[PDB]
Copies of this chain bind each other. A is one copy, B any other.
Amino acid sequence: LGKVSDKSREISEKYIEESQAIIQELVKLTMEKLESKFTKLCDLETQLEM
């Protein structure tokens, strides 16, 4: 069972690398979303001043 445990440990490391990559791409997408909503905020500010 020890060899099984060690192999599964290495596989788990592989999968945490994969998850790190996915999380980075998620961060990028949320950044784009926030930029769009920031432009929306600017328009709203113009309306308030009017």
Taking Cβ atoms with an 8 Å cutoff, the residues of A that contact B are: 16-17, 19-21, 23-24, 26-27, 30-31, 34, 37-38, 40-41, 44-45, 48-49
Contact = CB atoms under 8 A, between A and B. Distances in A.
Interface of A, secondary structure class, is helix
Copies of this chain, count: 2
Contacts of A48: 41, 44-45, 48
A24 B16 contact: yes
21 contacts: A16-B17, A16-B20, A16-B21, A16-B24, A19-B24, A20-B24, A23-B24, A23-B27, A26-B31, A27-B27, A30-B31, A30-B34, A34-B34, A34-B38, A37-B38, A37-B41, A41-B41, A41-B48, A44-B49, A45-B48, A48-B48
